[PDB]
Amino acid sequence: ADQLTEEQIAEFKEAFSLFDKDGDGTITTKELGTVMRSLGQNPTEAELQDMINEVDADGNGTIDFPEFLTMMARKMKDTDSEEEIREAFRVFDKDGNGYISAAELRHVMTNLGEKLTDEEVDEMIREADIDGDGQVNYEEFVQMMTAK
């Protein structure tokens, strides 16, 4: 009645803590635009001001807690399967050869606003590797979406 799985309620406020470095519930517009750069893309500093500007209802200069999902709200019209999966898979796997590279999240996660080396990611990759191989195949990270 109150809780089904603690991950969908507690770990969500764990995900918000990933971007919001201040802990007050606000991140810089430089980070959000970096979402493309995880795909090994281009940072939308100027365009995310076009989204921070509209979502800063409580005008944080940055972005607040409730108006965060509203930017995702416009494009959240009917989600796709493997297209939305690849929007996290090839976005995650810097190589994509049946295994995910170790030094990838230090590359990507750093781009996601948490500057760290493979060491910190190693615990992050170890979670995907039950055999402790230091890399992530399709089957282990797959498991992570059936249980986000």
């Binding site: 990933l18 971007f19 493309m36 893309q41």
Partner: peptide
């Protein structure tokens, strides 16, 4: 994190 981070990297499917 490989397990929880999925919801974090997946939030880039709206603008990208």
């Amino acid at each position: 994190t490989f397990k929880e981070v999925a919801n974090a990297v997946k939030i880039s499917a709206s603008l990208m």
